[PDB]
């Protein structure tokens, strides 16, 4: 967290005025090309692509969506829980407009999506292909409280002929970092069900390990909440091995606390072009989240 | 009824030039309130719109 000044322009040409706002470390980078820092930083979305706002009045929270069919074509939905991503199904339903969907941006997990009752399901395009993704459908959900307790401020300052920037002003009081919290016991039960379903060909061999590293859009669990792009970390999960005795690890019921990060910019669908900006949310930032899914990748660099 | 000079851009970005035209008082308003000594003005719609 840094408080940062720079110049801006009025609607006129020559009129320029200084102004200050707040920025994180994710948005900018230090110019180490010089002798030292010397308070010298630069936006990365700037020096890779162009820049624009994201219509701050248009907040980026989801809506129940339903996809409808044209004339002469229809939708067919299988009504079997354990029916995996392919194959033959009998319990059919013909439809004109899809069930209510919440198509939310989420990495490594699902959010507020449809559930898979009855049993837990695990699929992949080619499970024998280690590089393929392992899509998951849980039986139940979990209350996920990812939240920043610090209120946001806004400075709606005109720049152009009606063009205004919503700068993240100074925050009130002692400014702690964000965080996120999750239940332990229901989480361990869902883990028990998952590891009970993991035995595709084995009796006891299962391990989880965190990602080796890479793009932060893929290296953690990101999503959108009240407009802000939250990245709530995934580290309380990989430290889990229900290999030999499942009930052995049903005991450590612990309120799972973790640091959840945030973000303002995005290049959706990994298209490296003109990025966008996210405004403040003014007021403390809660985020409820259910859970209905998960995604993994197998370890090809191992036995 | 007044007439005003002001800068504008030349087709060369490094070059600008002062040009002058005529305007009324309805489309502008006084600013920098040294209340009456050759006060400068600003358009009514530019400070809020394009």
């Amino acid at each position: 967290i840094k408080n940062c000044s720079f110049n801006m322009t009025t609607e006129l040409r020559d009129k320029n005025r200084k102004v200050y706002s707040l920025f994180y470390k994710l948005d900018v980078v230090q110019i180490n090309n010089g002798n030292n820092s010397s308070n010298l930083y630069r936006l990365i979305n700037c020096n890779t692509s162009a820049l624009t706002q994201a219509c701050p009045k248009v907040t980026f929270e989801p809506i129940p969506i339903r996809y409808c069919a044209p004339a002469g074509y229809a939708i067919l939905k299988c009504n079997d829980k354990e029916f995996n991503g392919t194959g033959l199904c009998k319990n059919v339903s013909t439809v004109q407009c899809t069930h209510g969907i919440r198509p939310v941006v989420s990495t490594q997990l699902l959010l507020n999506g449809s559930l898979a009752e009855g049993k837990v399901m695990i699929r992949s395009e080619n499970i024998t292909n280690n590089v393929k993704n392992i899509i998951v459908q849980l039986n139940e959900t979990v209350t996920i409280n990812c939240t920043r307790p610090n209120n946001n401020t806004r400075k709606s300052v005109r720049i152009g002929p009606g063009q205004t920037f919503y700068a993240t002003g100074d925050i009130i009081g002692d400014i702690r970092q964000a965080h996120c919290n999750v239940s332990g016991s229901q989480w361990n039960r869902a883990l028990h069900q998952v590891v009970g379903q993991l035995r595709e060909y084995w009796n006891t061999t299962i391990i989880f390990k965190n990602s080796s590293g890479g793009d932060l859009e893929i290296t953690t669990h990101s999503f959108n909440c009240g407009g802000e792009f939250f990245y709530c970390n995934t580290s309380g999960l990989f430290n889990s091995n229900w290999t030999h005795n499942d009930t052995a690890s049903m005991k450590p019921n612990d309120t799972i606390t973790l640091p959840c990060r945030i973000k303002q910019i995005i290049n959706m669908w990994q298209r490296v072009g003109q990025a966008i900006y996210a405004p403040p949310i003014q007021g403390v930032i809660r985020c409820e989240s259910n859970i209905t899914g998960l995604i993994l990748t197998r370890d090809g660099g191992g036995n | 009824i007044k007439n005003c000079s002001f800068n504008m851009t030349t087709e060369l970005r490094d070059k600008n030039r002062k040009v002058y035209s005529l305007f009324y008082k309805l489309d502008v308003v006084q600013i920098n309130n040294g209340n009456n000594s050759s006060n400068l003005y600003r358009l009514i719609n530019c400070n809020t719109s394009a």
């Epitope: 005025r17 200084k18 | 040294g34």
Partner: antibody, heavy 137, light 111 residues
Amino acid sequence: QEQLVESGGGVVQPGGSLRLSCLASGFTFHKYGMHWVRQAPGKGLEWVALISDDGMRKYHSDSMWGRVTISRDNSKNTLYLQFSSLKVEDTAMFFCAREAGGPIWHDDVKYYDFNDGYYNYHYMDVWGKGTTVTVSS
Amino acid sequence: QSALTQPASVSGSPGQTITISCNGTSSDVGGFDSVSWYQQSPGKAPKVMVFDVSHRPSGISNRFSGSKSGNTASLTISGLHIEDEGDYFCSSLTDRSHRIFGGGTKVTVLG
């Protein structure tokens, strides 16, 4: 015109205090800094003190530093100087001067301070009317 | 503390160009390039003569050209006028954000 006026000066006594006030008109005093300077008879100038606009900073000459205290009044659009332990060395005429406008020109582009503020560390485009002050025991 | 030293009095005939020269130190003149020159006549308030030394101040004639070398400053003038008689004081901004003036230079018209 940014026409300024002095007040409070005159024949006075040593040891007490002296409220030297400086008003003005013809402009907006909300965001303008001000210098106090003095010059004695048969002697040139000597910088007394300086103050910014928004009460943030203020600077004193090490000679007069501590013996005097500068202050401002934004609503009144006024500058004030409170003396302490008045001395005959303060016998001089005192001038209340302005700053070199607000913006800075680069590539014929005028940059400004924060909150559209007038700022410089530069010459004084205007000078007050002046006030005599005669400290004598 | 040491004011920017210059002779307390100078003289010259009208029209004949002259050059005022004042001294400084490393603290103010060697510390920055914001060397100014003011003028004040008997019965007149002070007014500037130079700021931003190699460019001239508001509304003054095109004859008064400032220059600076190391810790010293100077101002060359052509077409010596009569109304310009009076004291001249160069000033420089110290490194501590404080300023300091000079001793003075009274211009007297010969003839």
